[PDB]
Chain A
Amino acid sequence: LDPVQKLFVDKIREYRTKRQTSGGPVDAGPEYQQDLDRELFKLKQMYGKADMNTFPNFTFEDPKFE
């Protein structure tokens, strides 16, 4: 069935129409960004604000003795 898979089609032609439009808050309106900023900030919370985009450096350290 391809009235069915016309509609798999029909959405998939807007797989391509939107995907080759752009997609995001695009073909779609601002809405996405207005969350997006906050939701990706939550990801910043999900890692802590330890910059998930700077290569980390590492501890050089000593425990105690006498």
Chain B
Amino acid sequence: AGLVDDFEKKFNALKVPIPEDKYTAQVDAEEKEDVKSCAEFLTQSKTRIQEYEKELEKMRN
């Protein structure tokens, strides 16, 4: 029961680290194809939408 108690104290004491992971660059592999969404077509689209919808009114006249 020295074994039991050894392992008992060890088990009572035994507290795992947590896992490994590594793809928290995906957080930022996001931000790139997070600005693509933004820049490319955020801005393009507002720009484009402006002239067009505005472009509705004047040629609606």
B21 touches A62 (CB 8 A): yes
Could you say which interface size class chain B belongs to?
10 to 19
Least CB separation from B8: chain A residue: A55
**Interfacial residues, chain B to chain A (CB-CB below 8 A):** 3, 6-7, 10, 14, 16-17, 19-23, 26
B21 touches A55 (CB 8 A): no
Take A53-B3, A55-B7 as given contacts and tell me if A65 and B23 are in contact as well, using a CB distance cutoff of 8 Å: yes
Could you say which interface size class chain A belongs to?
under 10
**Interfacial residues, chain A to chain B (CB-CB below 8 A):** 53, 55, 58, 60-62, 65-66
C-alpha spacing A62/B17, complex, angstroms = 13
A60 touches B23 (CB 8 A): no
A60 touches B19 (CB 8 A): yes
